[PDB]
Each structure stands twice: as structure tokens, then as C-alpha cells.
Paper text:
Human RNA polymerase (hPol) I has a single target gene, the 47S ribosomal RNA precursor (pre-rRNA), from which the 5.8S, 18S, and 28S rRNA are processed. Hence, dysregulation of hPol I is associated with pathologies, such as cancer and developmental diseases, for example, Treacher Collins Syndrome. A catalytic core of 10 subunits is complemented by a protruding stalk subcomplex and a heterodimeric RPA49/RPA34 subcomplex. The composition of hPol I is similar to yeast Pol I of which detailed crystal structures are known.
Here, we show how hPol I can be exclusively purified from a modified human cell line in its natural form and determine the structure of its non-crosslinked apo form by single-particle electron cryo-microscopy (cryo-EM). A 3D reconstruction with an overall resolution of 4.09 was obtained, revealing secondary structures for most regions of the molecule. The cryo-EM reconstruction of hPol I shows connected density for the common hPol subunits RPABC1-5, the RPAC1/2 dimer, the N-terminal domain of subunit [name], and most parts of subunit RPA2, with exception of the C-terminal clamp and anchor domains (residues 1,010–1,134). Furthermore, density for the jaw, funnel, foot, and most parts of the cleft domain of subunit RPA1 (residues 630–1,661 excluding loops) and for the RPA49/34 heterodimer allowed unambiguous fitting of homology models. Similar to yeast Pol I crystal structures and cryo-EM reconstructions of apo Pol I, the linker and tWH domains of subunit RPA49 are flexible in human Pol I. The N terminus of subunit [name] can be placed on the lobe of subunit RPA2, demonstrating stable association of the subunit. A C-terminal extension of subunit RPA34 specific to the human enzyme is flexible in the cryo-EM reconstruction whereas the assembly of RPAC1/2 reflects the conformation known in hPol III and tightly interacts with subunit RPA2. In our reconstruction, weak density for the stalk subcomplex, the clamp and dock domains of subunit RPA1 indicate increased shelf module flexibility but could also originate from technical drawbacks of freezing or sample preparation. We found well-defined cryo-EM density on the downstream face (front) of hPol I subunit RPABC1 (Rpb5) that is closely connected to the foot insertion site. Hence, we constructed a homology model of the foot insertion and fitted the resulting model into the observed cryo-EM density. This allows an unambiguous placement of the domain without adjustment, indicating that the hPol I foot insertion indeed resembles a built-in [name] box. Overlay with a model [name] box (box 2 of the human HMGB1 protein) shows that the DNA-binding site of the hPol I foot insertion is completely occluded by the common Pol subunit RPABC1, indicating a divergent function.
Residue numbers in the entry:
A (entry chain M): 22 to 143
B (entry chain A): 935 to 983
C (entry chain A): 837 to 885
D (entry chain B): 4 to 735
E (entry chain N): 9 to 113
F (entry chain I): 16 to 62
G (entry chain A): 1230 to 1362, 1495 to 1622
């Protein structure tokens, strides 16, 4: 049964041309509160250093306009008696990934000794 | 063979063995040589029968 | 040409997906290199044994 | 890699003359012992856990008469170490193999089963049945010599340095040989003319796949490709090949209304106008017969097949259809939706082949060929043979209402359980001859010469005999040289100078000295989450750049999503790191092969992972991290391997072979100055040396073997190759 | 982009999204949706079960967050919604729920 | 160019007739005179 | 131990099977009857011999066709919603390329194309349904439609003679087949023009360190009676076949021997 969410979800709220809809993806455990008061790129990818209860976590994020309208937002409708209807195409998508920490290419190379010339006669 | 970059230009990638039987053939060319020996003995036996 | 000339590289590459052109380059390369053998085993034996 | 950290630097003779020559050591030799890790390791895993998951798939079976639903099933079955029938008073009720050789008798085991006598639903009884015996590979976890030190050996008068791995049938010692079969759970392309003639409108093209389950029985797939525009499935069950269009399968699998099917089987080649038409045509020519919904198509298939499948005429027409479906199609997956996505990826490859975008992967290389261990053969023969015992007990119960005696309902279990359907004979047969008298080819194509008697005339005979792949006896009369010429890739996983010249030349290869078959299974538990919490997008999610350019990511029989152009190499390198450091449940046995997109006819693009058993693999060193690393057959083709130190170029190469001696096998590594010699002589000698006559063995009172050639006064040879010591050959 | 987290306005309903595996529909301004909340609010395996079954005239679509018939991301990748106001330049961040749909006959 | 989704359930059977096109599952019929799907075909393949 | 000899000159059955067919079979049966043919070493010989070569070649249809292009759907606007139509085009290889080799002209061969292709396509439609059971060009094409009403149109566009476009219409009752590839399965099957039996005749140099430089050409196939029409630019006295039977009936048995040997 559709209930009463924030008036920032009603489809009458999102039709604002001055408001943007953005879908974001983060792995199973990404805790959001670190980003609070932080910035996220609007195009391109920038490593961020999040602080989740003091621990320093780093994540590389993706910011680009989506493939054409991959899916729709369902928004509470005032006329439809709570029946949910589709929104517009979101203005962008965000992929969030922790950039690998402390990874170089591999190394400088490693040598081995050379055996060949053996004991020559006594 | 899993030692050379793909599409080199040394003739070594062919069959151009350079060493001899008094100084030793390098490791790679030892393989090609065996390939050739096997092919030869097979053709001999079959044409005999 | 460079030593891995991206042009020649790609050419040899695409034709690697064929038989006859590859055989053409095969034979050409063979009878190109096979005039260092006659300058190895002739400036050698039987003149320095 | 750490195993080879101690090779001798030039042999010596300090060890022929020490006060310690003669007194048995405590830890028997390491290398020599592990020289047969594979055999006993597999058979080990067979009986202690293999028929664990291999008795929980026999179907509940007994249905005799009187509207009864008795469904009696196995709860568990086990085997116990080989003891003696109760002697007058046997001092120790154990039998050691040395006894079994003398008396020309077998080395057996004890078979036990737990049948629950569910009287039309669980009511009564769990009766234990003494089925029969089974032979035991010496020094597995089932022979009395398990975990003994050398003195406890010699006191039992068994030779000090035992390696085991054989069976004992009437004194003989038979060994199961490793055969070769194609890759495990892989869509390998193929072309062949012989296919053309089976029916109407067959092209030559097609794909293939070999599917095997945990309870290791196998199944073989095939999807042809019609010229008309449709795609078929051509599998075989219980020795008869069967026919089924794709529409029936892609409807009967998942309800999942079809426009799903179309929009998914069409990945991003939207430009095409014949592909999609062929698609729609299939979807129609499956719709207008008798069926609209899922249960309907199931109804139809069952009604067609239950005449041949031979299920009980009790069951509905859809139940038998479903029973059939998950017994001969994509077994290894144990679900439906993944069965779907597997079929999908198969057909997508088949199309992009027939149209000619890729290159026909060779089905004859070593990049697409792996090995059968004796544990597999043993376990699967056993699991097939259990069914026969059930059905035989059925006829044993039917003889009651046949002789019009008292067809009893219970309390007759004990009597009706002794029919004469024992397992002794069928197992003694398989080894006594090597023949495979059976009802299922189990994926194999032949049935004879399976285990051949290991001689004892020397020590080189043994030491080879246990290291010898062969490619099936059927490929001998063939005249094509392509089944003999060493493909340039087998470097390191086969020996180039060790083939046994003669009649079975070229094929009866032997392994290298630095490869170890893989036989430890892992818990495939948390790897998909590990993939997806990086760039990898979920399987059917909204992939941010999802069209013509993106890589599938199969996982040893599981679709997991898609990756895009930037990431694939980054992901492969990250998994390189997380294997070599051995960090998070990522086994070292793992292969990470990504095949880039050539824009030209070439290998099918992708990115593939595996963990399955029965694969060849050999160590190398890495130049990124000091540690050593394992390389699978498939992923050599895209690596730079520098043999000598003088070659190592900065930035282009990545590996370094451990020592140059790798290429050869071990026997062919006992020859001195062997790169100077000419090749056919190397080969002639590797054949000769096994023929000779030296010091066979110590205990000349244990064995009543028929022919023992002995040489009175052998001598250590003065000019020696290093690996003569590392295997302590001098004792022989 | 100023990053502000609000949580869930009610705590049991995120931003509900619908992705059909079969492409992009044409006039979804005509559809009505059916959200299902499992009434066993105690058992964390059932307390959270949601069934996003979508009645459409052509296709009886249904979305879920469970089984082989859902996306693992809903179980391995969280989803949020970004509400960016072009005037004062603020992004409003909630929790968002993706669901994958399948049409039943 | 599959006859895609608004009301039916399945693949809409081919025009292949005289009258307008129904569905099999729900029976929602549409004008036989709508489709103009124009197909392109093979090419250079002969050298 | 494989030969290093052989120009690329149609080497014929090696090994024992040749022996078997000579002693153990003795049948006509021949795989490639490569006949021998010298040119009586006259002076002019050239303006005649090369034209001879050309005219004794054999070109079929599958050699000269380079592209096929189909556009097949949509037939509802042609006065009514009726039998499904097929837009169709052919691209050959430019006239300069083959023209030097095969002694051919792209226009009269196009005439043969329109002449035979259409009875051919009617055969193909026939068998499919069984198995399923310029004002001058104006009169040409309208007669095409006459003797074949199914054939709606034809347009040999006059300038290029390197590309032809037709347009057809047949009923939509029968289900479509490999039409886009049935053009291909009927391409190869056709042969434009060929003498009876003989296909392949080539031209190379004689040998001097062997004998007296009697220039030779290299034919293939046995129809002796035909060779005589060319009577003055060859040496019909030193002429032996690879067959042992084509000359048998034309010359004798004492004929056969020297060639057997």
C-alpha cells in the first residue's frame, strides 16, 4: 500500500526544471555520512577520501549522463490516488568505487646470478 | 613460442638455428628441432607400409 | 619501416587470417634468408679445419 | 615454487661413504614422494567426500504395485579400511599389502549402505546392506600403511621408499592411466563437414560444451546452426541422440514473457536486419502449435518424450518433462535462470561465428584440453553402478508377485534384500581387463585398455609409468600428422623428446617435470561479490555503457555481468595481485584470461575465470612481485616469458622461468650433455633406457612376481646430471 | 555538489525505481504500480521482503529484491537518489531501491 | 523490427492475411496497415 | 620427401592410384585429362594464339559477380496490401579487370544475364514451393513481364554497365527462404559460355636444354575432334593426351602404347 513520503518524492515535486534527478550506485557497504559536506564530481572521475567514523576511506566515483533513459523514477501521484507513475529521465548516474590503495605497476626487475664457468683444473 | 613478442622480425622466429653440435643449441631452438624429427619419422614409416 | 612497424604489423596480422598470402610472405622470407647459409658454410669448412 | 628451492649445484659422492649409510632415516624423501601427489590425492578425495555429494542424486525409485508410494532412498554410504574375515584367532585383524601379493589375492574394502524403508511415506525401517567389496589404492587414507615412518615400514617388510597409487588384483599391480577430454564447462566453437548429413538444412557450424557435475557424471551439448535461420539443440541421453528446436527450450525454461528473450538475445548488434528476423521467426514458429504459457510447453514436451524417457506412468506429463530437463541440459549449474543465460551466451557466440566476426577456435590444441584422473572414473562408475543395484532389487521384489507368493509389504525386507546383485564381479572386471562393460560412455568415446599392468623390471619403468598422459587408443590408425606435430604452445606441459616411438608414437606423451595437475577444490563462496564491488556491473542491471563494446564475464559456468573498455585490463591486473599475494579466498589455482577485441576475426572476446579440478599448471616467477606464481594452460598465450637472464628487457616482459631445464620430462632429464646430441638419438635413448636391466628392488622375499632380472654388481656412474641426486636414484 | 543525506523519509520506503529488462517503453505515463511490503516486521529475512509487481496491459511485470530473479547489487551495491536543485545548487540524497521486472504470462 | 509492446502479450503473428492483426494471448487487434519495416541485406561478400 | 619441382601447373594424380587406374582399373575415370599441345612454330602465330587462348577459356557466373544487394519488405502501398516485393541489385568487377583476361564484354553478357537468370529464378521459386508443397530495353523488359507476369520490372541502367537493378513481386503465402543467399546458390550454378568438355588452357615456354625449342601451351581436358578447328597454329602431328582412351578411339592401339609408356 503506497504511503505518504516526503513531498520531495511526489511527481509534482520533481517536474521542476530547476531540480535534477540523479541515480547513484555504491557497493553493499558504502556508508553515506562521510560524503556529508563533501563534493562529488559532475562529469569525470575524481578520487574522494571519505571519513566514516574517523577511518580514512578513498573512493573513485563515476559521473556522466546516462545511456538514454535506462529506467524511470516512480513518484507518488496526487491525482492517481497514490498509484505510482513514472518520472522523467534522470539527469545523470553515479558509480562509486574504492580506488585500489597502494598499488604500483609492479616493481623494478630482479636479477639472478650466472653459473656457467666452473672450476678449471687443479 | 612463449618466449618472443608476437610478430617479431628476427629470422629466429622461423627455424634459423645458428648454433652447432659442438657448442650447444639454445633452449628455444631445441623445440623446433624435435618437431622436425617427429614429422620426418612419421612420413617414413607410413610410406614404407 | 620501424622494427615493429604498426603498418607492417597490421598487414602481417590481417593476412594471418588467410592461407595463400601468408604462404607468399613465408616463401619470400625463406628464400631471402637462405643466402646467409651459403656465406656461413662456405667461408667455413673446408678452409679452416 | 618453494618446492624447487633446493636443487643441488653439481652432484657429489660424499654420500656413498658416510657412517650414516644404511640406517633408515625418519622423514622419507620429499620430492620422490610427491611425484605421485595427483593419483592418491584424487582417490583420497573420492571415497571420503565424493560419494557424499554422489549418493544425493540417485532418484527415489521403488514402485511395484497396489497404489503404493514407497520411496526408499539412501541416507548415507561409506567404506571402511580392509580387515580380515574373522580368523580362528587372528592376532591383529588387519591385512597389509605384502600379504596380498604373496597369496595372489586382492586388496579389498567394505561397502555399507543406509536404506530408509518409507512405507508410502516414511513409516518403517532403516536397513543396512552389505553390498560388496572394492579395491583400495595403497597409501590413500584407506590403507593400513597410512602415515607410517620408515622403520614401521621395513618391519612390515615393505620397501622403504614407497610411493603407491596402484591396485592389487591377484598379485598384479594395475594402474589407471590419465586420459584427455575437452575443457570443463566452456563454449568451444567448432567446424566440421561430417555434421552436414544428419537431416535437412544443417550447416557445418556449431558450438559445443562439456558439462560435469559435482557428483561427477558428465553430459555433452551441441547447438547446430541452420541455414534457414533457426538454431537447434542436439544432445544425447542414455545412448540415443535427441532433437529439439531452440524455441521450446527458451520457453520451457523460464516463464519470463518472450520480448525479454528477444531483447536480451540481441546484444548490441541492433543494426542487423537478418539476425532479428531470424529471432522473431523462431519465436513465432514455437508459438503456434499447442502452447502459450510455461506449463503448456512443459506439457507438450513431456507428452512427446515420456515414451522414450521411461519414467513411471504414475507421474503427470509435466513432471517427467521437468525431470528430463535437469538431467541432460547444462547440469553444472543447478538452477534455471543461469541455465538460460548460458544458452544465451552460447547462441550469441554461434551467430557471431557463422556470420564470420571471430576466428574458429581450434578444438585440438592444449588450450582446450584437460585430463581425467582415476578418481573421476572410479566415482562415476560407482554412481552409475548403484542405480543398477536399485533396479535389480526391484526385479527381486517383483519375483514375489511373479511367483504368486506372498507379495509382502514389510518385515520381508531382510529376505528380499539378498538377490545376488553384488558389486564384486563388475569391479574386478574393469581392472582385470581394462574393459568398460557398462551402459553409459560417461563422456568417453572408448571402453578398453583403461588400466595396464605396471612392470617392475626397473625403476625407470615405474618412474615414467606414473607420469603418462595418453590421448585415447582410438586415435592410432589415423594418418593425419596434426595429431602428432607439437603445437608450439605445449612448451612446458609436455615433453618433446619422450614420446614412445613405435606404433603409439606421438600421442602417448609424458608430462613435464614442473607441472602438477590441480586436485584441490575450493569453496566458491564470496568471489562474485568481490567482482561486483569493483567496476563489474551486475548481470541484468543497468550497465552504464551497455552496447556492442563490453565484455561478458563468465565464471566457470556462471554469467556475472559485463565490463567496459577501460576496465577489463585493470580488473585482470588487480586479480593478478590478489592471487600472488594470496589474500582473500582467491585460490592460487585460478586463471584470469582476458581476450581483447581485435576488431578482426580472432578469438571470441571475453574474460574468463576458473577454479575447477583436473587442469595442467606449472610455476613461474614474476618480475612485478618476488613471489612465484602458477600459470594455467589457457593463459600462456598472452604472457612474456624470458628464459635466460641476458634477455630480460625492462618494460616489455613480465616473467622469468625458474631454471632452463624445465622443458624436458624427468627421464629425458637423466641424459648427459643432451643439447649437444641430435634429437632422434635423444628420443631413441629415452625409449631404450626403460628397457634395460639393473637393480630392480630390495625385498626379494616380498614379491612372488614372475620375472625379476637382476644385475650383480651395478655402479654409480661417474658423469652425472644434477637431477640424478634430487631423486636419490643412486639407491637403484 | 553539496552532499546532504536524509535517510529514508519513512524508513521502510526508499525511492522506488523500475527497470524492465526488455528495453525502454514508450508511454509509461499511463501505468499504475503495486508495492508489496511483507507484514512480518520481525524476521530480518522477511521483515524486509518487497515485491514490486507491475500490472501492465501487455506485460504482467514483477520486480523483487530476492533470489536469482533479483539483482545482486540490491544485495551487493546500495542505490541512492540525487536531487540537484539548479537554483541554490544542492543535491538531496536519499536511499533508493532498484527492482528488476519480469513479465508473467 | 518485432511488433513491440503495448497491449498483447506475445509476438504478434505475421500479417500474412486479409484483415487486421490480433494477438493470440489477449486478442488486442491493431491495424494491418501500419508496418513499413524496410530491410537491408548482403553485400561485398564476393571477391 | 616432397618434390621441389612443379610450376603450379595442374599436377595430376600422383602415387599409387595412378598406377592402379592404369593397370588395376584401366577405366576412363580420369581425374584431370591434361592434354599435351605444341604450337607449330610459325611466325605470326600470336594475334591468333592469344585470341585462341581467350576463346578456349571458360567463365561461369560465380567468377564475375562481386556484390548482391537486397531490400525486401513492405509491400502494402503498391495499390493494396499485397504480395511481398524484392528490391535487388548486382555489382560486378570493373570491365577492365576481367576484360584483359577472358575476352568478354559487359553488355552482351548482361544480355545473357537477363536472358537466363529469369527462367532460372522461376525454376528456383518452383522448387522452393515444391519442397514446401530505352524503348528497345522497354520492349525487352515488358516482354520479360509478359512471358513472366511475376516479374514486375527490370532496369539495365545504360551508362555504367557495371550495375543492374531489378524489382520483383511474388505472393506472401510461401515463407521466405535464403533469398539473399538463393541469389548466391544460383550464381555459382550458372556458367555463361564454355566449349564442350574442355575448361582450362594455359600458355608458357618450351624447353631448350632439353630439345629444339618447340613452344608449348598447356591445355586440360579431352575432346580431340574439337581441336582441329584450330588447324594452322599448332602441330597436330606431335599431339598425345594424358588419357589412354581419348586417343585410343581416335588414333588406334599402336597409338596407345607410346603414351602408356
Amino acid at each position: 500500500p503506497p504511503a505518504s513520503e516526503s513531498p520531495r518524492f511526489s511527481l509534482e515535486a520533481l517536474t521542476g526544471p530547476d531540480t535534477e534527478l540523479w541515480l547513484i550506485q555504491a557497493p553493499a557497504d558504502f556508508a553515506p555520512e562521510c560524503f556529508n559536506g563533501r563534493h562529488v564530481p559532475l562529469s569525470g572521475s575524481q578520487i574522494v577520501k571519505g571519513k566514516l567514523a574517523g577511518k580514512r576511506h578513498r573512493y573513485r566515483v563515476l559521473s556522466s549522463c546516462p545511456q538514454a533513459g535506462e529506467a524511470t523514477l516512480l513518484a507518488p501521484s496526487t491525482e492517481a490516488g497514490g498509484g505510482l507513475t513514472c518520472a522523467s529521465a534522470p539527469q545523470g548516474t553515479l558509480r562509486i568505487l574504492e580506488g585500489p590503495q597502494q598499488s604500483l605497476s609492479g616493481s623494478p626487475l630482479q636479477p639472478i646470478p650466472a653459473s656457467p664457468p666452473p672450476q678449471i683444473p687443479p | 613460442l612463449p618466449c618472443f613478442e608476437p610478430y617479431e622480425f628476427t629470422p629466429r622466429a622461423g627455424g634459423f638455428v645458428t648454433g652447432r653440435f659442438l657448442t650447444g643449441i639454445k633452449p628455444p631452438e631445441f623445440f623446433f628441432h624435435c618437431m622436425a624429427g617427429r614429422e620426418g619419422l612419421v612420413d617414413t614409416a607410413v610410406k614404407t607400409s | 619501416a620501424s622494427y615493429d612497424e604498426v603498418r607492417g604489423k597490421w598487414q602481417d596480422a590481417h593476412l594471418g587470417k588467410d592461407q595463400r598470402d601468408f604462404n607468399m610472405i613465408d616463401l619470400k622470407f625463406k628464400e631471402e634468408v637462405n643466402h646467409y647459409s651459403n656465406e656461413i658454410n662456405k667461408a667455413c669448412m673446408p678452409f679452416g679445419l | 615454487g618453494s618446492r624447487w628451492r633446493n636443487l643441488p649445484s653439481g652432484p657429489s659422492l660424499k654420500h656413498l661413504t658416510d657412517p650414516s649409510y644404511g640406517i633408515p632415516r625418519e622423514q622419507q624423501k620429499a620430492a620422490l614422494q610427491e611425484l605421485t601427489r595427483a593419483h592418491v590425492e584424487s582417490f583420497n578425495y573420492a571415497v571420503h567426500e565424493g560419494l557424499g555429494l554422489a549418493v544425493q542424486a540417485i532418484p527415489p525409485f521403488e514402485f511395484a504395485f497396489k497404489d503404493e508410494r514407497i520411496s526408499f532412498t539412501i541416507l548415507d554410504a561409506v567404506i571402511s579400511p580392509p580387515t580380515v574375515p574373522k580368523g580362528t584367532i587372528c592376532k591383529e585383524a588387519n591385512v597389509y599389502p605384502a600379504e596380498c601379493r604373496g597369496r595372489r589375492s586382492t586388496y579389498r574394502g567394505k561397502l555399507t549402505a543406509d536404506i530408509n524403508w518409507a512405507v508410502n511415506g516414511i513409516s518403517k525401517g532403516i536397513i543396512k546392506q552389505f553390498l560388496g567389496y572394492v579395491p583400495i589404492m595403497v597409501k590413500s587414507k584407506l590403507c593400513n600403511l597410512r602415515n607410517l615412518p620408515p622403520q614401521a615400514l621395513i618391519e612390515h617388510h615393505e620397501e622403504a621408499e614407497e610411493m603407491g597409487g596402484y591396485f592389487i588384483i591377484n598379485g598384479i599391480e594395475k594402474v589407471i592411466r590419465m586420459l584427455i577430454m575437452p575443457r570443463r564447462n566452456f563454449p568451444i566453437a567448432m567446424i566440421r563437414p561430417k555434421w552436414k548429413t544428419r537431416g535437412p538444412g544443417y550447416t557445418q557450424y556449431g558450438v559445443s560444451m562439456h558439462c560435469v557435475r559435482e557428483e561427477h557424471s558428465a553430459v555433452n551439448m551441441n547447438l547446430h546452426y541452420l541455414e534457414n535461420g533457426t538454431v537447434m539443440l542436439n544432445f544425447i541421453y542414455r545412448k540415443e541422440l535427441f532433437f529439439l528446436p531452440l524455441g521450446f527450450a527458451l520457453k520451457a525454461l523460464v516463464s519470463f514473457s518472450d520480448y525479454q528473450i528477444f531483447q536480451e538475445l540481441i546484444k548490441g548488434k541492433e543494426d542487423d536486419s537478418f539476425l532479428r528476423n531470424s529471432v522473431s521467426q523462431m519465436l513465432r514458429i514455437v508459438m503456434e502449435e499447442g502452447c502459450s504459457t510455461q506449463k503448456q510447453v512443459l506439457n507438450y514436451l513431456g507428452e512427446c518424450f515420456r515414451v522414450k524417457l521411461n519414467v513411471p506412468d504414475w507421474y503427470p506429463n509435466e513432471q517427467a518433462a521437468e525431470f528430463l530437463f535437469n538431467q541432460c541440459i547444462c547440469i553444472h549449474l543447478k538452477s534455471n535462470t543461469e541455465k538460460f543465460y548460458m544458452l544465451c551466451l552460447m547462441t550469441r557466440k554461434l551467430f557471431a561465428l557463422a556470420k564470420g566476426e571471430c576466428m574458429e577456435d581450434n578444438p585440438d590444441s592444449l588450450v582446450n584440453q584437460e585430463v581425467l584422473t582415476p578418481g573421476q572414473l572410479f566415482l562415476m562408475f560407482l554412481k552409475e553402478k548403484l542405480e543398477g543395484w536399485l533396479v535389480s532389487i526391484k526385479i527381486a521384489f517383483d519375483k514375489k508377485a511373479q511367483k504368486t507368493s506372498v507379495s509382502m509389504n514389510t518385515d520381508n525386507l531382510m529376505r528380499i534384500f539378498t538377490m545376488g546383485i553384488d558389486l564384486t564381479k563388475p569391479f574386478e572386471y574393469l581392472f582385470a581387463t581394462g574393459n568398460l562393460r557398462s551402459k553409459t560412455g560417461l563422456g568417453l568415446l572408448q571402453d578398453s585398455g583403461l588400466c595396464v599392468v605396471a612392470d617392475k623390471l626397473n625403476f625407470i619403468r615405474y618412474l615414467s609409468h606414473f607420469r603418462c598422459v595418453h590421448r585415447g587408443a582410438d586415435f592410432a590408425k589415423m594418418r593425419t600428422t596434426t595429431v602428432r606435430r607439437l603445437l608450439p604452445e605445449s612448451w612446458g606441459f609436455l615433453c618433446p623428446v619422450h614420446t614412445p616411438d613405435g606404433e603409439p608414437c606421438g600421442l602417448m606423451n609424458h608430462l613435464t617435470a614442473v607441472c602438477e595437475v590441480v586436485t584441490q577444490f575450493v569453496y566458491t563462496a564470496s568471489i562474485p561479490a568481490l567482482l561486483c564491488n569493483l567496476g563489474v556491473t551486475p548481470i541484468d542491471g543497468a550497465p552504464h555503457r551497455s552496447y556492442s563494446e563490453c565484455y561478458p564475464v563468465l565464471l566457470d559456468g556462471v554469467m556475472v555481468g559485463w565490463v567496459d573498455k577501460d576496465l577489463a585490463p585493470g580488473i585482470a591486473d588487480s586479480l593478478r595481485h590478489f592471487k600472488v599475494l594470496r589474500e582473500k579466498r582467491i585460490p592460487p589455482w585460478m586463471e584470469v584470461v582476458l581476450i581483447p577485441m581485435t576488431g578482426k576475426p580472432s578469438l571470441y572476446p571475453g574474460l574468463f575465470l576458473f577454479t575447477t579440478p583436473c587442469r595442467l599448471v606449472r610455476p613461474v616467477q614474476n618480475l612485478a612481485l618476488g613471489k612465484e606464481e602458477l600459470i594455467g594452460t589457457m593463459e600462456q598465450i598472452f604472457m612474456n616469458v624470458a628464459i635466460f637472464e641476458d634477455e630480460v628487457f625492462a618494460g616489455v616482459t613480465t616473467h622469468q622461468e625458474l631454471f632452463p631445464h624445465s622443458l624436458l620430462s624427468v627421464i629425458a632429464n637423466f641424459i648427459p650433455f643432451s643439447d649437444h646430441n641430435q634429437s632422434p638419438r635423444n628420443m631413441y635413448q629415452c625409449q631404450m633406457g626403460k628397457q634395460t636391466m639393473g637393480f630392480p628392488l630390495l625385498t626379494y622375499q616380498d614379491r612372488s612376481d614372475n620375472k625379476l632380472y637382476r644385475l650383480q654388481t651395478p655402479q654409480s656412474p661417474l658423469v652425472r646430471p644434477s637431477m640424478y641426486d634430487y631423486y636419490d636414484m643412486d639407491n637403484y | 555538489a553539496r552532499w546532504q543525506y536524509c535517510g529514508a523519509p519513512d524508513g521502510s520506503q526508499r525511492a522506488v525505481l523500475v527497470q524492465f529488462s526488455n528495453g525502454k517503453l514508450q508511454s509509461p505515463g499511463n501505468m499504475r504500480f503495486t508495492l508489496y511490503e511483507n507484514k512480518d516486521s520481525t524476521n530480518p529475512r522477511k521483515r524486509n521482503q518487497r515485491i514490486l509487481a507491475a500490472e501492465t496491459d501487455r506485460l504482467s511485470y514483477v520486480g523483487n529484491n530476492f533470489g536469482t530473479g533479483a539483482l545482486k547489487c540490491n544485495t551487493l551495491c546500495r542505490h541512492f537518489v540525487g536531487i540537484l536543485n539548479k537554483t541554490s545548487g544542492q543535491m538531496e540524497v536519499y536511499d533508493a531501491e532498484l527492482f528488476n521486472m519480469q513479465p508473467l504470462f | 523490427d518485432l511488433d513491440f509492446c503495448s497491449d498483447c502479450g506475445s509476438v504478434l503473428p505475421l500479417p500474412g492475411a486479409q484483415d487486421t492483426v490480433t494477438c493470440i494471448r489477449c486478442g488486442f487487434n491493431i491495424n494491418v496497415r501500419d508496418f513499413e519495416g524496410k530491410v537491408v541485406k548482403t553485400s561485398v561478400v564476393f571477391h | 620427401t616432397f618434390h621441389f619441382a612443379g610450376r603450379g601447373e595442374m599436377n595430376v594424380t600422383l602415387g599409387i592410384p595412378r598406377l592402379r587406374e592404369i593397370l588395376m582399373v584401366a577405366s576412363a575415370n580420369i581425374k584431370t585429362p591434361m592434354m599435351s599441345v605444341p604450337v607449330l612454330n610459325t611466325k605470326k602465330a600470336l594475334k591468333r594464339v592469344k585470341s585462341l587462348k581467350k576463346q578456349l577459356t571458360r567463365v561461369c557466373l560465380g567468377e564475375v559477380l562481386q556484390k548482391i544487394d537486397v531490400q525486401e519488405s513492405f509491400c502494402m502501398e503498391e495499390k493494396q496490401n499485397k504480395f511481398q516485393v524484392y528490391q535487388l541489385r548486382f555489382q560486378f568487377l570493373p570491365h577492365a579487370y576481367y576484360q584483359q583476361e577472358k575476352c568478354l564484354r559487359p553488355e552482351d553478357i548482361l544480355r545473357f544475364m537477363e536472358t537466363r537468370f529469369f527462367k532460372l529464378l522461376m525454376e528456383s521459386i518452383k522448387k522452393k514451393n515444391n519442397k514446401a508443397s530505352p524503348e528497345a530495353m522497354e520492349r525487352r523488359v515488358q516482354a520479360v513481364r509478359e512471358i513472366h507476369p511475376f516479374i514486375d520490372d527490370y532496369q539495365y541502367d545504360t551508362e555504367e554497365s557495371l550495375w543492374c537493378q531489378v524489382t520483383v513481386k511474388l505472393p506472401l503465402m510461401k515463407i521466405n527462404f535464403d533469398m539473399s543467399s538463393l541469389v548466391v546458390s544460383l550464381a555459382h550454378g550458372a556458367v555463361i559460355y564454355a566449349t564442350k568438355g574442355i575448361t582450362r588452357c594455359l600458355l608458357n615456354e618450351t624447353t631448350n636444354n632439353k630439345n629444339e625449342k618447340e613452344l608449348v601451351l598447356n591445355t586440360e581436358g579431352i575432346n580431340l575432334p574439337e581441336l582441329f578447328k584450330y588447324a594452322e597454329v599448332l602441330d597436330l602431328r606431335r599431339l598425345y593426351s594424358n588419357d589412354i582412351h581419348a586417343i585410343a578411339n581416335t588414333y588406334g592401339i599402336e597409338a596407345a602404347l607410346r603414351v602408356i609408356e
